């Protein structure tokens, strides 16, 4: 009797694919033939942020467009001042294997979670002169893989037990749980309107969720291997991924299909991070062969290379589009402009 | 006046220097015991839904650092990347609850992030094998080449040849996997749950590992 139900399910999966496929009038590449290319982009390193004992895992810009935070295997969070290279804070952690960090939209909190299944919240602006942990969110089973702030109150976490979550900081209790992934989830990104968020997992699929109703909405497939990084288009209607098979793809949101792929035959290593420019004209991706490449988001042309002594692990583009920050496994952060 | 900001930055850097010294003088170790393998006994090293279970122990003024692993589900494909720099890996196995152990051993061997890391393999509970041999150990049932096997070596006195045959049979079943690759080496030991020399064995093994590293550095070999 299981097959009966199974047959009907595969039956549905058959209808979805055919209906989606019978919509492509023309490709994204054809529609951009008329336009002149960006050309050649030369970026020169301006600063070099030093101080980390060991390999770097994450970073996140501040809304102030001047400050940034970074995390390392040592168990350190350091908040920099990207204009004058000073150090503002240096926070030591309880667990040394940390994989994520995020910087609050209002600039009051920073959070980080790692391989010990707990997301920690630190209070930066207090009547004392120290940074204290104010909440320890527990309830996941696998390691945390990403976290992002909504307000001074609500946070979204991704873990290694194939679940996402939405929390409530003052109560400290899980509010909504998003289930449906098969493999462990590697990254997530938010949306400009803070109503939807996307996620990418190691079962080679990406799903779009709704925060209020706590249920899945769509599903995009096409990647051969697991997903390492996901980013969201500034408009709110597209997003791009980066996987272990040396490919970065772009998916439409309300068209529910697969647009231009960004790949070349000289790369065999995978991608660790992706990010956009303010106008969405350039997609820049951090690679595994010690190099970071920048792409034209509309025609897939390599235009510029940001040449680190080890694997590149994180990226970032400032809210107002000044500069780009990169981190790596040899422990130095560089700001390209 | 940003001079006070510069002073704050300099004090932070001064503390980071001390942290670097302490970090650089220490040694890290990963433990990868099996499900029923009694690593709970081997972690009894006080007499010298969480995750990583950090412990610390020192012998003869050298600081060690052993990280167990907690509730990280079942797959180790992704979180094994974080341990690309440890000094050694410490198996614990039980002496058919052996075939899956061999498969796990060969999977942890010949990875892409554990290419240059040596394994300190432990054989735990070496009384189960003795009692099975003396009484129930039909090794030939699932290991047919046991019958056509024999050693010269340096056995331990007060034992029948059967127990030693079994012991070096298992030891060879691991050593052949180790040798079928010379960037790293396996270190098989026959130990028991309640022992005394475990820390000494780990000490000598790490000493040999970094001695080989230094000899490689100045091309003495």
């Amino acid at each position, epitope marked *: 009797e299981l097959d009966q139900l199974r047959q009907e399910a595969e039956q549905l999966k058959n209808q979805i694919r055919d209906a989606r496929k019978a919509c492509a009038d023309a490709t994204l590449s054809q529609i951009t033939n008329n336009i002149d290319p960006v050309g050649r982009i030369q970026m020169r390193t301006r600063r070099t942020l030093r101080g980390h004992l060991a390999k770097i895992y994450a970073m996140h810009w501040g809304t102030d467009s001047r400050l940034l935070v970074s995390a390392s295997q040592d168990g350190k969070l350091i908040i920099w001042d990207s204009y004058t290279t000073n150090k*503002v804070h240096a926070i030591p952690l309880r667990s040394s294997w940390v994989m994520t960090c995020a910087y609050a939209p209002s600039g009051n909190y920073v959070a980080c979670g790692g391989l010990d299944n707990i997301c920690s919240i630190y209070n930066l602006k207090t009547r*004392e*002169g120290n940074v204290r942990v104010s909440r320890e969110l527990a309830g996941h089973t696998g390691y945390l893989s990403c976290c992002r702030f909504l307000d001074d109150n609500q946070i979204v976490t991704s873990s290694g037990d194939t679940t996402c979550a939405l929390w409530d900081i003052e109560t400290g209790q899980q509010t909504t749980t998003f289930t449906g992934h098969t493999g462990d989830v590697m990254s997530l990104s938010l949306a400009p309107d803070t109503r939807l968020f996307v996620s990418g997992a190691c079962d080679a699929s990406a799903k779009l969720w709704d925060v209020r109703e706590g249920m899945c909405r769509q599903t995009f497939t096409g990647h051969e291997s697991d997903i390492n990084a996901i980013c969201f288009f500034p408009n709110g209607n597209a997003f791009a991924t980066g996987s272990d098979d040396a490919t970065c793809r772009l998916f439409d949101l309300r068209a529910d299909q697969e647009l231009m792929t960004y790949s070349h035959d000289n790369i065999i290593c995978g991608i660790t991070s992706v990010s956009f420019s303010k106008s969405g004209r350039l997609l820049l991706a951090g690679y595994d062969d010690f190099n970071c490449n920048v792409w034209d988001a509309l025609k897939a042309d390599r235009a510029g290379v940001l040449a680190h002594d080890n694997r590149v692990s994180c990226l970032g583009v400032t809210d107002d589009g000044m500069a780009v920050a990169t981190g790596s496994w040899d422990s130095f952060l560089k700001i390209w402009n | 006046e940003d001079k*006070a*900001a510069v*002073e704050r930055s300099k004090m932070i850097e001064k503390q980071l220097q001390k942290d670097k010294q302490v970090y650089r003088r220490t040694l890290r170790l990963l433990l990868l015991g099996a499900d029923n393998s009694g690593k709970s006994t081997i972690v009894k090293q006080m007499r010298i839904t969480s995750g990583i279970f950090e412990t610390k122990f020192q012998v003869d003024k050298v600081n060690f650092h052993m990280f167990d692993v907690g509730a990280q589900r079942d797959e180790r494909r992704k979180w094994i990347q974080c341990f690309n720099d440890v000094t050694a890996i410490i198996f614990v196995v039980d002496s058919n609850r052996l075939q899956e152990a061999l498969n796990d051993f060969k999977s942890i061997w010949n990875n892409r992030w554990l290419r240059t890391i040596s394994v300190i393999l432990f054989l735990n509970k070496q009384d189960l094998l003795a009692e099975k041999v003396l009484a129930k150990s039909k090794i030939e049932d699932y290991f047919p080449e046991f019958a056509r096997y024999t050693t010269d070596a340096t056995p331990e006195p007060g034992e029948d040849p059967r127990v030693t045959r079994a012991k070096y049979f298992i030891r060879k079943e691991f050593v052949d996997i180790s040798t079928a690759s010379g960037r790293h080496i396996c270190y098989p030991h026959f130990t028991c749950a309640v022992d005394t020399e475990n820390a000494r064995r780990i000490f000598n093994d790490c000493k040999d590992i970094i001695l080989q590293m230094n000899l490689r550095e100045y091309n003495l070999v």
Partner: single-chain antibody, 232 residues
């Protein structure tokens, strides 16, 4: 967060005294510390300064070889040692907290004070008036005048307003001429052009009466203003 000062008394001229400000309730090892003097019938006046790591010390030009300042981090105690007391050192002394990093608010918390009785090229800050009569329920304005451009190359404008209530220690209202403190009600504002500054209060209640002070922080000599009392 509370600081309590000890010492004081009546001293004959030519003697020496050791004042103390004991800190309890925060991280005393991460804050710069000052000392600020108040003559009985005049505005405030700067005295000394010692930074967090004891690596930098400045003194006011009035007394430089007679006063010395030191700190003791493990016990959370701040010391001032003074020698050869003239007839001018007969005023109130306050110990003031200060922390300097991008976005911080210096001079935010003030001590309680201690009493003591004895038997050139720096920027000049002046205030237009010294009193003003008003009525509750309408806006007021206070004007401050500078003798040099306080605006710096980076873009900051270093001006502070304190508003000492009549009977207790001073507080902080506006730091760097535009930014607001933490616990102050949201009816205060500040504006300026580079040499002339104005402070506006939209409403007015019974807690707004007091004396308002105009401090600059561009260079070490710190020149305080005169003060405009609001009488109701």
């Amino acid at each position: 967060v509370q600081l309590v000062e000890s010492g004081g008394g009546l001293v004959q001229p030519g003697g020496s005294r050791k004042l103390s400000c004991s800190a309890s309730g925060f991280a005393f090892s991460s804050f710069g510390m000052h000392w600020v003097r108040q003559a009985p019938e005049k505005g405030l006046e700067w005295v000394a300064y010692i930074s967090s790591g004891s690596g930098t010390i400045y003194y006011a030009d009035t007394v430089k070889g007679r006063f010395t300042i030191s700190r003791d981090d493990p016990k959370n105690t701040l010391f001032l040692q003074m020698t050869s007391l003239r007839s001018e050192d007969t005023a109130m002394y306050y110990c003031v907290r200060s922390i300097y990093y991008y976005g911080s608010s210096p001079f935010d918390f003030w001590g309680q004070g201690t009493t003591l009785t004895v038997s050139s090229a720096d920027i000049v800050m002046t205030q237009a008036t010294s009193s003003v009569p008003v009525t509750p329920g309408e806006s007021v304005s206070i004007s401050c005048r500078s003798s040099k451009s306080l605006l710096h190359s980076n873009g900051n404008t270093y001006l502070y307003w304190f508003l000492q209530r009549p009977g207790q220690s001073p507080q902080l209202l506006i730091y760097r001429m535009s930014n607001l403190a933490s616990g102050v009600p949201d009816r205060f504002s500040g504006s300026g052009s580079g040499t002339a500054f104005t402070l506006t209060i939209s409403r007015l209640e019974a807690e707004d009466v007091g004396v308002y002070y105009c401090m600059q922080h561009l260079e070490y000599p710190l020149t305080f203003g005169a003060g405009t009392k609001l009488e109701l």
